[PDB]
């Protein structure tokens, strides 16, 4: 590739100086040199890309499917497929549809990957897990079936491994299948929650990986990442409501990691003159992901007016302000002046029917923190001889679902409780919501949101 050479662009940019003729220069034809190494930009795909596969590639995938149907021994099937894969891999390398894992390309002619996995999960991948006995009951056609059914299996998130051969196009699946696969999860697997939280979380993480292999960011990639985030939000409320032990941190990390990836795609589409119809909603979740991070406040300011003035973003900004508390103490956190700490307003917003339900699920993760600093802040404005605060007043203020919930909260923070119905706030000693020795208090929810959820199906909520 070389520097572009167009009459319009040359005229548009303009001459370097006023008049080369006066200085003594003479017009001269110059070779179109290669553009400098810093100037190369690899624009990711932003429009629909036609799906094409080699006739030998599709024939090979068809052939191994028949072997899977015919052969009954799992070990025999896995060994045969492995040998078939080795022969297939050499053909693709010579064909030029996959890197050789040792080549040195110049990034100008790098292979544009194109997955060809027509079914939900790669046929070789399904066979491998058959002998590993790592197939969940959901994927099997019947609970007693030995090998996973093609119509119901799913691809496992392949963790990066050292000295691992790059994936063949037969493994990665094309985007128009990923949309179909995600539609399978939404319709036929969401009701299995919360018993299948680890299964769905791993599988959805695989789906985003297939996009990364193909370096694809088209409308399907935006659509798929959008619904993945909404699954995490809904799956976030189910786990706490159902009270099932689950790795909360890995859920938030993937949720935040998806949001920045999704937000990054929005910028590229905007930079290319396109638009994404659901950008406003998913900018809002980005703000809520790190409530107390000022870096997310400046980013939302640089966005255009129509995005910044959308009610979803405006609602998100209101929450970020009312959560902002100056007394918020946390290791490696710097306090800021004149923070509102409007705990009372926050709980008035959470009951507002105009609040989108998914945002409500996101904010429940901060209920323990807000309630603590609400009680911490209130305690500082009471004289030493004040009577204990009755629980009825606190439940009205902080929206505790039941008297059993508040008593656990007071008991966790070593707040003295009087007569089983009043809290003596002057006995609070901790200035931080976190205790170094003790495990964090279990996440809770709001009965208003849970009651609201029961009036709408999962799939209707996820699609929008």
């Amino acid at each position: 590739k070389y520097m572009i050479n167009d009459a319009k662009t040359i005229q548009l940019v303009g001459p370097l100086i006023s008049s080369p003729d006066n200085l003594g220069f003479q017009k001269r034809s110059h070779k179109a040199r290669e553009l400098p190494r810093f100037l190369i930009n690899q624009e990711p795909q932003l429009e629909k890309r036609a799906f094409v596969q080699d006739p030998w590639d599709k024939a090979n995938q068809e052939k191994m499917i028949s072997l899977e149907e015919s052969i009954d021994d799992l070990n025999e099937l896995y060994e045969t497929l492995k040998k078939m894969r080795n022969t297939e891999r050499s053909i693709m390398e010579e064909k030029g549809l996959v890197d050789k894992a040792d080549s040195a390309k110049d990034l100008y002619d790098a292979i544009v990957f194109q997955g060809t996995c027509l079914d939900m999960c790669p046929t070789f991948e399904r066979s491998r897990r058959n002998v590993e006995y790592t197939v969940y009951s959901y994927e099997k056609n019947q609970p007693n079936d030995k090998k996973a059914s093609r119509t119901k299996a799913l691809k496992v998130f392949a963790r990066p491994a050292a000295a691992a051969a790059p994936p063949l196009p037969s493994d990665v699946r094309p985007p128009h299948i990923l949309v179909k696969t995600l539609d399978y999860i939404v319709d036929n697997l969401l009701t299995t929650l919360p018993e299948s939280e680890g299964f769905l979380w791993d599988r959805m993480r695989s789906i985003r990986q297939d996009f990364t292999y193909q370096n694809y960011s088209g409308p399907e990639a935006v659509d798929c990442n959008e619904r993945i985030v909404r699954i995490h939000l809904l799956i976030l409320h189910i786990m706490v409501k159902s009270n099932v032990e689950f790795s909360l941190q890995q859920e938030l990390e993937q949720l935040h990691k998806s949001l920045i990836t999704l937000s990054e795609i929005y910028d590229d589409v905007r930079s290319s003159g396109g638009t994404c119809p659901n950008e406003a909603e998913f900018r809002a979740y980005a703000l809520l992901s790190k409530i107390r991070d000022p870096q997310y406040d400046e980013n939302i300011q640089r966005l255009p007016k129509h995005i910044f003035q959308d009610k979803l973003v405006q609602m998100a900004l209101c929450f970020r302000r009312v959560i902002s508390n100056s007394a918020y103490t946390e290791r490696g956190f710097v306090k800021t002046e004149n923070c509102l700490n409007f705990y009372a307003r926050f709980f008035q917003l959470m009951q507002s029917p105009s609040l989108p339900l998914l945002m409500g699920f996101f904010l429940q993760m901060h209920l323990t923190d807000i309630r603590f600093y609400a009680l911490r802040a209130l305690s500082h404005t009471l004289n030493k001889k004040h009577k204990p605060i009755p629980f009825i007043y606190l439940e009205n203020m902080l929206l505790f679902n039941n008297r059993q919930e508040i008593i656990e909260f007071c008991n966790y923070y070593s707040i003295e409780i009087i007569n089983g119905d009043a809290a003596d706030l002057k006995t609070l000693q901790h200035y931080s919501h976190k205790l170094s020795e003790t495990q964090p208090l279990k996440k809770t929810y709001l009965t208003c949101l849970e009651r609201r959820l029961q009036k709408t199906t999962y799939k209707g909520l996820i699609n929008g």
Binding site: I40, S103, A104, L107, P160, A162, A163, P166, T212
Partner: protein
Amino acid sequence: LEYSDNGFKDFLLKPELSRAIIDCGFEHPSEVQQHTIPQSIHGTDVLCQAKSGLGKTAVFVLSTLQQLXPVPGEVAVVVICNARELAYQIRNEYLRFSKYMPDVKTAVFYGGTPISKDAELLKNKDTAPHIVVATPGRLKALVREKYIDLSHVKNFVIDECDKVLEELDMRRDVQEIFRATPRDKQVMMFSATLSQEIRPICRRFLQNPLEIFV
């Protein structure tokens, strides 16, 4: 009633380096990767300890490649390890990320290898490696024979420093090899386990480090 007062796109990596990361799908930073990579690009020495299986090896490889300035006639960075098989893993790790950097050359060395052959490829301009990973025994012989010019060493990378520094003879070797390299450079070491006893020995040749211990 009275008053009473009382994702690796936040670092601006090279386009070649980023695309190689994308094509591998490894777009999930670890906790150690989250903290060290922004620190690594600054050039500050880091003494970080991390658990096995967290992609510790790729952490410095990205850091080295991002800071790598490729000159045909010199070796940029030197990586020292004790295990031959681990060394081959490191080269394979480098090969994966060096996919879109053809000008980068990398070679490895180990004991029991024909030293003349290793010097032969180093002498050749075409096969001159910008990055070398070697055992302490072989590297010391190459340095003591003046086969490798270490005046251009920029980053000093050690894998499993505690294991190598535990052995006094290899402690002598790495100290001797460090002398052939200029003082003004970056020194980074990583290991699965880093006890308190080995820290002062590590800190002896480290200035203003970033210590992370598990």
